[PDB]
Design an enzyme around this catalytic site. Structure first.
Site, PDB file in Angstrom:
ATOM      1  N   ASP A 147      59.057  44.370  47.646  1.00 36.85           N
ATOM      2  CA  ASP A 147      57.971  43.571  48.156  1.00 36.85           C
ATOM      3  C   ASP A 147      58.297  42.090  48.530  1.00 36.85           C
ATOM      4  O   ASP A 147      58.237  41.172  47.672  1.00 36.85           O
ATOM      5  CB  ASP A 147      56.801  43.588  47.153  1.00 36.85           C
ATOM      6  CG  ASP A 147      55.516  43.046  47.778  1.00 36.85           C
ATOM      7  OD1 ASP A 147      55.632  42.286  48.763  1.00 36.85           O
ATOM      8  OD2 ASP A 147      54.404  43.412  47.338  1.00 36.85           O
ATOM      9  N   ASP A 183      55.335  40.258  54.677  1.00 37.65           N
ATOM     10  CA  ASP A 183      54.901  40.922  53.440  1.00 37.65           C
ATOM     11  C   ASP A 183      55.160  42.364  53.538  1.00 37.65           C
ATOM     12  O   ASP A 183      54.412  43.041  54.216  1.00 37.65           O
ATOM     13  CB  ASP A 183      53.403  40.794  53.213  1.00 37.65           C
ATOM     14  CG  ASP A 183      53.025  41.230  51.831  1.00 37.65           C
ATOM     15  OD1 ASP A 183      53.914  41.781  51.180  1.00 37.65           O
ATOM     16  OD2 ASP A 183      51.878  41.024  51.352  1.00 37.65           O
TER      17      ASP A 183
HETATM   18  C1  LIG Z   1      51.899  34.574  42.528  1.00 42.82           C
HETATM   19  C2  LIG Z   1      53.042  34.069  43.372  1.00 42.82           C
HETATM   20  O1  LIG Z   1      53.760  33.228  42.887  1.00 42.82           O
HETATM   21  N1  LIG Z   1      53.347  34.467  44.600  1.00 42.82           N
HETATM   22  C3  LIG Z   1      52.697  35.411  45.452  1.00 42.82           C
HETATM   23  C4  LIG Z   1      53.401  35.468  46.823  1.00 42.82           C
HETATM   24  C5  LIG Z   1      53.029  34.226  47.591  1.00 42.82           C
HETATM   25  C6  LIG Z   1      54.154  33.236  47.426  1.00 42.82           C
HETATM   26  C7  LIG Z   1      53.266  34.580  49.019  1.00 42.82           C
HETATM   27  C8  LIG Z   1      51.204  34.992  45.598  1.00 42.82           C
HETATM   28  C9  LIG Z   1      50.528  36.314  45.196  1.00 42.82           C
HETATM   29  N2  LIG Z   1      51.553  37.251  44.666  1.00 42.82           N
HETATM   30  C10 LIG Z   1      51.353  38.623  44.343  1.00 42.82           C
HETATM   31  C11 LIG Z   1      50.593  38.735  43.026  1.00 42.82           C
HETATM   32  C12 LIG Z   1      51.559  38.515  41.877  1.00 42.82           C
HETATM   33  C13 LIG Z   1      50.711  38.084  40.685  1.00 42.82           C
HETATM   34  C14 LIG Z   1      50.460  39.032  39.649  1.00 42.82           C
HETATM   35  C15 LIG Z   1      49.677  38.693  38.507  1.00 42.82           C
HETATM   36  C16 LIG Z   1      49.184  37.360  38.469  1.00 42.82           C
HETATM   37  C17 LIG Z   1      49.454  36.407  39.529  1.00 42.82           C
HETATM   38  C18 LIG Z   1      50.216  36.772  40.646  1.00 42.82           C
HETATM   39  C19 LIG Z   1      50.741  39.375  45.545  1.00 42.82           C
HETATM   40  O2  LIG Z   1      49.621  39.879  45.477  1.00 42.82           O
HETATM   41  N3  LIG Z   1      51.468  39.547  46.671  1.00 42.82           N
HETATM   42  C20 LIG Z   1      50.932  40.241  47.822  1.00 42.82           C
HETATM   43  C21 LIG Z   1      51.172  39.314  49.017  1.00 42.82           C
HETATM   44  C22 LIG Z   1      50.284  38.072  48.982  1.00 42.82           C
HETATM   45  C23 LIG Z   1      50.716  36.857  49.413  1.00 42.82           C
HETATM   46  C24 LIG Z   1      49.841  35.764  49.399  1.00 42.82           C
HETATM   47  F1  LIG Z   1      50.275  34.546  49.791  1.00 42.82           F
HETATM   48  C25 LIG Z   1      48.530  35.843  48.998  1.00 42.82           C
HETATM   49  C26 LIG Z   1      48.121  37.059  48.562  1.00 42.82           C
HETATM   50  F2  LIG Z   1      46.886  37.218  48.113  1.00 42.82           F
HETATM   51  C27 LIG Z   1      48.979  38.141  48.559  1.00 42.82           C
HETATM   52  C28 LIG Z   1      51.590  41.597  48.044  1.00 42.82           C
HETATM   53  O3  LIG Z   1      51.267  42.075  49.357  1.00 42.82           O
HETATM   54  C29 LIG Z   1      51.339  42.582  46.843  1.00 42.82           C
HETATM   55  C30 LIG Z   1      49.981  43.321  46.761  1.00 42.82           C
HETATM   56  C31 LIG Z   1      49.917  44.558  45.920  1.00 42.82           C
HETATM   57  C32 LIG Z   1      48.610  45.224  45.755  1.00 42.82           C
HETATM   58  C33 LIG Z   1      48.434  46.363  45.072  1.00 42.82           C
HETATM   59  C34 LIG Z   1      49.559  47.035  44.392  1.00 42.82           C
HETATM   60  C35 LIG Z   1      50.731  46.412  44.569  1.00 42.82           C
HETATM   61  C36 LIG Z   1      50.930  45.118  45.341  1.00 42.82           C
HETATM   62  C37 LIG Z   1      52.320  44.504  45.406  1.00 42.82           C
HETATM   63  N4  LIG Z   1      52.535  43.506  46.545  1.00 42.82           N
HETATM   64  C38 LIG Z   1      52.759  36.750  44.773  1.00 42.82           C
HETATM   65  O4  LIG Z   1      53.777  37.294  44.457  1.00 42.82           O
END
Ligand SMILES: CC(=O)N[C@]1(CC(C)C)CCN([C@@H](CCc2ccccc2)C(=O)N[C@@H](Cc2cc(F)cc(F)c2)[C@H](O)[C@H]2Cc3ccccc3CN2)C1=O
Length: 386
Positions: free
Chosen positions: A230, A34
Site C-alpha cells: 500500500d 495510493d
Molecule cells: C496515518 C499516516 O501517517 N499516513 C497515512 C497516509 C498519508 C500520508 C497519505 C494517512 C492515513 N493512513 C492510512 C491509515 C493508517 C492509520 C491506521 C490507524 C490509525 C491512524 C492511521 C490510510 O488509510 N491510508 C489510505 C490512503 C489515505 C491517504 C490519505 F492521505 C488520507 C486518507 F484518508 C487515506 C489507504 O488507501 C488505506 C485504506 C484501507 C482501507 C481499508 C482496508 C485497508 C486499507 C489500507 N490502505 C496513512 O497511512
C-alpha cells in the site's frame, strides 16, 4: 521511459503525488498515489488545506452521473459527486483517457496540510471501488481505452532526513512508470511474488526475521486477515500478535539504548545529535514472500533507515530525530510507503504478480544495504493464506 522518470514528489509521511490535468480546458492537480484504494477522486469545493481544487462548472467535457459516493479510509473519509471527464498525465504516457472522477464535496481528516496534493488515485482493483465494483477505477479505464500495457511500477524515494515545504516541492521525489519497467531505477534482479487475488494487492508473507532471527510464528498469523502492498500507507503495519512479537525483538536487539514506551507505539519522536544516529544498534527486517515457483520463495530486507522515519526536531535544531514507522493493525499487514521506499515496485497486473528489486533510490549506510534475495526452500507455504 525517460519522459516518465522522476515524475513523483512528496515523502513517506505525507504521500507521494504525481501531476495530472482534468477537464476542458485542462486544470492541473497533484494526485496522491495510493495503491491501497481504487477511487480516483479530486477535491471540488474550497478547503483550508487546498490551494486548488477541481472545478466542474469550468470544464466543457465534464459529465455528471447523478450519483453520490462516500469513501471511508481507515482514518479519514470523504463525500462526493460522481461524474466523468477528460484525464492526462503530463509526465506519463502520452494519452488522454475518459475517467470516472469523484468530486469531493465534504471531507473529514482526509486531506493533508502542506502535503501539496488535492486528489487521490486509487490504483487498486474494481472489487473495492466505492460504491461498488461497477465503477471502473482509473487504471482500468486507462488500459481499455489505449495502448499502455497492463502494468505500472513505483520507485518511492525518501530523503533519510526531514524535508521542508520548500524542499519537497523542490525535491525530485520518485517515479511512476505507467505501462513499463525501467532499468535505471533499481539494482539486482526483480523477484516476483504472486497477487493472491485482484482486490487489494494482496501478497503472501511466508517468514519474518529480525537481524536474521526467525520470529517463528504460525505462517497465516503474518498474513492475518490480509497482506497488502500500500503506497497510500505511511507505515509498516503489522497484525497485533505479529507487532508485539516484532517490537519485542527490536526492543531486545536495540537494547544498548533505552527508549520511551511511546516511541514504540509510534507517537513520540526520539533524537540524537547531528549525524550520531546509531543505525548500527537496530536490526534489519526480512519479509519472506512466496515465490512464483511452487514451494520456492524470496526475501526483502529493510534497514532502520526505512523504518525509522525522519521528522523535524522538537524545535528545528541540528539534532536528527525519527519516528518508529512500524505500528499495529487489525486488518492484516500493510507493506507501506517506508518499506516501499526500500524497493523498486512493479505492479504487473497482466501477470497477476508483484515485482521487487533493490531501489537505486534507497537510504543505506556504508555497512548494510537493502536486499532482494532468494531462492529459499522453506516448506509449509501452500496454506499461509487466510
Ligand atoms: C496515518 C499516516 O501517517 N499516513 C497515512 C497516509 C498519508 C500520508 C497519505 C494517512 C492515513 N493512513 C492510512 C491509515 C493508517 C492509520 C491506521 C490507524 C490509525 C491512524 C492511521 C490510510 O488509510 N491510508 C489510505 C490512503 C489515505 C491517504 C490519505 F492521505 C488520507 C486518507 F484518508 C487515506 C489507504 O488507501 C488505506 C485504506 C484501507 C482501507 C481499508 C482496508 C485497508 C486499507 C489500507 N490502505 C496513512 O497511512
Amino acid at each position: 521511459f525517460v519522459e516518465m522518470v522522476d515524475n513523483l514528489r512528496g515523502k513517506s509521511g505525507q504521500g507521494y503525488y504525481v501531476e495530472m490535468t482534468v477537464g476542458s480546458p485542462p486544470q492541473t492537480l497533484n494526485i496522491l498515489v495510493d495503491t491501497g484504494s481504487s477511487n480516483f477522486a479530486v477535491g471540488a469545493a474550497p478547503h483550508p488545506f487546498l490551494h486548488r481544487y477541481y472545478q466542474r462548472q469550468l470544464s466543457s467535457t465534464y459529465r455528471d452521473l447523478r450519483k453520490g459516493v462516500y469513501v471511508p479510509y481507515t482514518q479519514g473519509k470523504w463525500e462526493g459527486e460522481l461524474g466523468t471527464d477528460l484525464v492526462s498525465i503530463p509526465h506519463g504516457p502520452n494519452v488522454t483517457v475518459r475517467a470516472n472522477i469523484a468530486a469531493i464535496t465534504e471531507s473529514d481528516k482526509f486531506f493533508i496540510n502542506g502535503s501539496n496534493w488535492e486528489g487521490i488515485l486509487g490504483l487498486a482493483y474494481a472489487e473495492i471501488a466505492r460504491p461498488d465494483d461497477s465503477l471502473e477505477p482509473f487504471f482500468d479505464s486507462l488500459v481499455k481505452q489505449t495502448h499502455v500495457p497492463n502494468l505500472f511500477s513505483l520507485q518511492l524515494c525518501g530523503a533519510g532526513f526531514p524535508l521542508n515545504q520548500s524542499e519537497v516541492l523542490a525535491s525530485v521525489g520518485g517515479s511512476m512508470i505507467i505501462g513499463g519497467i525501467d532499468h535505471s531505477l533499481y539494482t539486482g534482479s526483480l523477484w516476483y511474488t504472486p497477487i493472491r487475488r485482484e482486490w487489494y494487492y494482496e501478497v503472501i508473507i511466508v517468514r519474518v526475521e529480525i537481524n536474521g532471527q526467525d520470529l517463528k510464528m504460525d505462517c497465516k498469523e503474518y498474513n492475518y486477515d490480509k497482506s497488502i502492498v500500500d503506497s497510500g500507507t505511511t507505515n509498516l503495519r503489522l497484525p497485533k500478535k505479529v507487532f508485539e512479537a516484532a517490537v519485542k525483538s527490536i526492543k531486545a536487539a536495540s537494547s544498548t539504548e533505552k527508549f520511551p514506551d511511546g516511541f514504540w507505539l509510534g507517537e513520540q519522536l526520539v533524537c540524537w545529535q547531528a549525524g550520531t544516529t546509531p543505525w548500527n544498534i537496530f536490526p534489519v527486517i526480512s519479509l519472506y514472500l512466496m515465490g512464483e515457483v511452487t514451494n520456492q520463495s524470496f526475501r526483502i530486507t529493510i534497514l532502520p533507515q526505512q523504518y525509522l522515519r525522519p521528522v523535524e526536531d522538537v524545535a528545528t535544531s541540528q539534532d536528527d530525530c525519527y519516528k518508529f514507522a512500524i505500528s499495529q493493525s487489525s486488518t492484516g499487514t500493510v507493506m507501506g510507503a517506508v518499506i516501499m521506499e526500500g524497493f523498486y515496485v512493479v505492479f504487473d497486473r497482466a501477470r497477476k504478480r508483484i515485482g521487487f528489486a533493490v531501489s537505486a533510490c534507497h537510504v543505506h549506510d556504508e555497512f548494510r544495504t537493502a536486499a532482494v534475495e532468494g531462492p529459499f526452500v522453506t516448506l509449509d507455504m501452500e496454506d499461509c493464506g487466510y
